[PDB]
Structure 1
Amino acid sequence: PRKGPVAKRDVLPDPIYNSKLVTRLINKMMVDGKRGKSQAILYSAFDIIAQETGKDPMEVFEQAMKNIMPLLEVKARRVGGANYQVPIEVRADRRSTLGLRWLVNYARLRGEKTMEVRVAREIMDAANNTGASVKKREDTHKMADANRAFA
């Protein structure tokens, strides 16, 4: 904050799938501290993804995430103008934060039936550069490239 950088909290890898980003996704679909609901609605999603597609769920998740994480992003601040939307390179950690935030902020609004599905066919859409979150990343990249002089 004001004194200096503060250490993060490491995320213990989940069971079953044994990854890191999966737990950070479970922590993002959480509401009111209800761990069980998010856990169930994510494991159901990664099972039906294999039932429908035929591939390893984690491969589909990874090859859908690699298309959502942005690179450049517009920050309103000084240096190069008083809040002139200077485009900056997001740090290595900030990528997955934005990726999961966009994956979940849009999986809540797809709107067919229970979300236990709404999250799955958003990962499928992200696996081939379509949907809404991928559109968000593309729009952000366009806006970042618009201000190619303020850097």
Structure 2
Amino acid sequence: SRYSPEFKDPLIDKEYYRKPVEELTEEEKYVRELKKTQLIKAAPAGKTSSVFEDPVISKFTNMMMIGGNKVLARSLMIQTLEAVKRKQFEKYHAASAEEQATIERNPYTIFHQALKNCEPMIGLVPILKGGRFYQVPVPLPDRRRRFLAMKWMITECRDKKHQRTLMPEKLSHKLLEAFHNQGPVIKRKHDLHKMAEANRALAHY
């Protein structure tokens, strides 16, 4: 890294700075006087203080990026969010006053809940025993569960089964499926859990 270990990561949070002094604790008062003597890394081009900043969608965009083409990756993302919103406005206008209350039209709420429905609680590890391989179940950390939900969704949309369908239509269709606990990605979660139940007797390895 071109940053010496002395450089600290920047904290981009407007609220963190406007917080009054009186509310601060003696520990939080020390952290603030300390950072005034520390070197701070330049803020990356990715994240800003904008009110529309979403770290989860920004991460999903990077996991879709091919060969540093962020413009294309982000274009696909915003086209998916627009395709999700238009599909829900079409379902909303076609519904009755009672069903309309249950129809979600916010694509960020759908995107977040769609991924949370795909996160696998437990996973498997390929372990070797006596020249023979047997998988072992293990709890998954929070980072790993969130990463696997985004990798399974992107992998499913890149599958060759989809013929000539553009990515914003594929991803929007899969997100709305997972939002309703349906789809291939939800099945992958269920299969991983079901396999991790058939290997419970192998938890001692």
For normalisation by structure 1, the TM-score amounts to 0.83
What CA distance in whole angstroms lies between the structure 2 residues aligned with 1:48 and 1:17?
18
Residues 31-79 of structure 1 show CA distances to partners (whole Å, capped at 9, x for unaligned) of 1110001100110110121111141111101111111000111112269
| Greater Rg by CA | 2
Tell me, yes or no, if structure 1 residue 148 matches structure 2 residue 200: yes
Q: How does 1:98-109 map to 2 (within 5 A)?
A: 98-109=148-159
Partner of 1:34: 69
Partner of 2:19: none
Among candidates 133, 137, 143, match of residue 185 of structure 2: 133
Unaligned segments of structure 2, at least 5 residues: 1-8, 11-43, 90-104
Larger strand fraction of residues: 2
Unaligned segments of structure 1, at least 5 residues: 1-8
Give the CA RMSD over aligned residues: 2.4
Tell me, what secondary structure is at the counterpart of 2:201? coil
CA contact (8 A) 1:75 1:87 kept: yes
What CA distance in whole angstroms lies between the structure 2 residues aligned with 1:67 and 1:31?
26
For normalisation by structure 2, the TM-score amounts to 0.63
Shift in Å, 1:111: 3.4
Kindly indicate whether structure 1 or structure 2 has the higher relative contact order, using CA contacts under 8 Å at least 6 residues apart. 1
Q: What amino acid does structure 2 have at the position aligned with 1:56?
A: N
Specify whether residues 131 and 112 from structure 1 end up closer, same or farther in structure 2 by C-alpha distance, changes over 3 A only.
Answer: farther
Partner of 1:123: 175
Aligned length: 141
Tell me, what secondary structure is at the counterpart of 1:75? strand
Partner of 2:54: 19
Tell me, what secondary structure is at the counterpart of 2:78? helix
Residues 11-46 of structure 1 show CA distances to partners (whole Å, capped at 9, x for unaligned) of 954757311111111101111110001100110110
Q: What amino acid does structure 1 have at the position aligned with 2:197?
A: D
Tell me, what secondary structure is at the counterpart of 2:202? coil
Tell me, yes or no, if structure 1 residue 56 matches structure 2 residue 106: yes
What CA distance in whole angstroms lies between the structure 2 residues aligned with 1:127 and 1:13?
27
Specify whether residues 13 and 96 from structure 1 end up closer, same or farther in structure 2 by C-alpha distance, changes over 3 A only.
Answer: farther
Tell me, what secondary structure is at the counterpart of 1:84? strand
Partner of 1:6: none
